[PDB]
Amino acid sequence: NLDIIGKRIEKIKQEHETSWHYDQDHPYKTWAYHGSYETASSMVNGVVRLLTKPWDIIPMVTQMAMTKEKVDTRTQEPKEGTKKLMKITAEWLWKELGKKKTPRMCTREEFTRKVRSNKWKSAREAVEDSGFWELVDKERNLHLEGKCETCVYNMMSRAIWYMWLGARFLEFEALGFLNEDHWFSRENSLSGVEGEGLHKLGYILRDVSKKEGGAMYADDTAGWDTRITLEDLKNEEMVTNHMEGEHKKLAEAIFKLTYQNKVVRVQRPTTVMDIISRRDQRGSGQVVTYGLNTFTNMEAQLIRQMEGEGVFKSIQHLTVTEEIAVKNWLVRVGRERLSRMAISGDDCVVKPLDDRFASALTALNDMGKVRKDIQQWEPSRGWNDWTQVPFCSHHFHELIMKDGRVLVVPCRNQDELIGRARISQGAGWSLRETACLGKSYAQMWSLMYFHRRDLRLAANAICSAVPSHWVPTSATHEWMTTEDMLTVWNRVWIQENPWMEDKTPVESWEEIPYLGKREDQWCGSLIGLTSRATWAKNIQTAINQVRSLIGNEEYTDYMPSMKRFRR
Ligand SMILES: O=C(c1ccco1)N1CCN(C(=O)C2CC2)CC1
Ligand SMILES: [Cl-]
Ligand SMILES: [Zn+2]
Ligand SMILES: [Zn+2]
């Protein structure tokens, strides 16, 4: 333990030798405390808020802009039968994921290009300073030597662990391939959805619905990242078994020194910097966190499926022939069972063979993946209709175009969409940068949420209010473009859509349908309210208010793309 974390602890004690104090009133039980030393609210987007006036009196919108007891927890050691199921399943899953992919190191060039597209002031500055890279080299050579000096986390149902850019590089070099080479694409992982836009996710859920079987289950885990066991981290580490030479050694060091042993500096108002350590839980880059969460979720859900199908009798202990049965299940039907699932990190949808899955809870609870908002042994409540299943914060509607073609569209409560577009993060936004962020939300709404009456109108208004040539600023983001949004809509929903056989382009926005008016209201629309009527009728006055603030620029009127403003 301290042989792996001591050097990092020693180095920090020195940069604060006139403060090091072993507080005895420390608030840590599950985190090991080592010592102490002496040591970003949401802003409103004015462009979006001025063009969404009716929502100024909707508390579900307005409260979103205003204003850890789970990290300090301890998950128990799984039983021996549970550990066997996880090791057999993880071994088989890394082999399947690796059948058509080659693990490889990511490069300083790739890392530099990422930072250049979002002592040293910023990341862009450090990437260019050859002094930085000489620091990376020292740490790198130390990792090859099996030791760590500078890979330390900083803390800040969310908890984000920043490290310095150098440590982030070493993580990206060893494990970036998982994301950069799409190991969790649907084509490669079967259950995954990595690189699938919101315009794909509903079609994927409808394809899972077409399988014979039981209800669709979408159980959320209570604090997934806090329930990652040291056994989970050891099964995730087995990806290094597919690696070779240097890469194998560099990846092994990231898992050993930074994931399976962690050093964290947390601020305590009491102000002292708390240097704490622990072996378990998730604490990695957010992108590596997504892939390893997807992997360990796919494993956990296949084991729950095995439990429901009776592949093993008890988690207490696998018999020798139960192990052969688990292996033979994976080889015989593993790829089919993966295709019965849609898994995005800690978020899953599973269509099992039948509803025995609902009460198959012993492995899931013993792995520590305890379900949110339900008693530990109460059977899961499944969904009978793919259009009601929650996934990635959405549900999905089946929408038939006047010409008979079928759109499967993403949806969520409209107060959440408007309340999020009204918020910026960070300081020093110019009026132009605030306008270009509003334009990014407006174009996302035109592409993904065109079927919501209020959002198509508000999107058209924002795009009318912001200069036509200004570039939108700050999954697939096809809305981040200055191309005409009708041309982008045709490319995404018709041309490139593998579920649409007839490729006839749409010639105008009037061909593109809305939800039913009652369904639009059920999902949050203000259609029918006097306020919404006054907003819609007077929208050119709101557009002109924003144009007057931005000043004398080139603007386009997009409002006559809608039937009601077309004379
Ligand atoms: O519900 C609707 C409507 C508009 C489009 C589809 O349905 N309306 C018409 C506009 N309205 C008004 O002008 C009334 C003064 C509020 C409210 C009733
Ligand atoms: Cl249902
Ligand atoms: Zn290190
Ligand atoms: Zn909806």
PDB file of C-alpha atoms in Angstrom, residues 36 65 67 72 100 130 149 203 240 300 303 360 383 417 462 476 482 490 508-509 544:
ATOM      1  CA  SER A  36      -3.425  18.293   5.956  1.00  0.00           C
ATOM      2  CA  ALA A  65     -30.191  28.223 -12.854  1.00  0.00           C
ATOM      3  CA  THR A  67     -27.534  27.748  -6.294  1.00  0.00           C
ATOM      4  CA  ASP A  72     -17.261   7.858   2.062  1.00  0.00           C
ATOM      5  CA  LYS A 100     -11.808  -7.174 -34.475  1.00  0.00           C
ATOM      6  CA  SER A 130       8.962  20.817 -24.230  1.00  0.00           C
ATOM      7  CA  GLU A 149       5.284  10.414  -8.069  1.00  0.00           C
ATOM      8  CA  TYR A 203     -34.157   2.970 -33.411  1.00  0.00           C
ATOM      9  CA  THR A 240      -3.748  -5.600 -20.559  1.00  0.00           C
ATOM     10  CA  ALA A 300     -23.024  -7.507 -14.603  1.00  0.00           C
ATOM     11  CA  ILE A 303     -24.524 -12.445 -15.184  1.00  0.00           C
ATOM     12  CA  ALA A 360     -32.836 -12.613 -10.355  1.00  0.00           C
ATOM     13  CA  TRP A 383     -41.694  -1.737 -19.317  1.00  0.00           C
ATOM     14  CA  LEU A 417     -34.534  21.240 -22.357  1.00  0.00           C
ATOM     15  CA  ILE A 462     -32.800  32.152 -31.887  1.00  0.00           C
ATOM     16  CA  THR A 476     -22.635  12.887 -32.455  1.00  0.00           C
ATOM     17  CA  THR A 482     -22.958  26.713 -40.344  1.00  0.00           C
ATOM     18  CA  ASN A 490     -31.990  15.425 -44.614  1.00  0.00           C
ATOM     19  CA  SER A 508     -39.205  22.063 -46.693  1.00  0.00           C
ATOM     20  CA  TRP A 509     -39.619  22.123 -42.888  1.00  0.00           C
ATOM     21  CA  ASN A 544     -35.820  42.450 -32.892  1.00  0.00           C
TER      22      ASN A 544
END
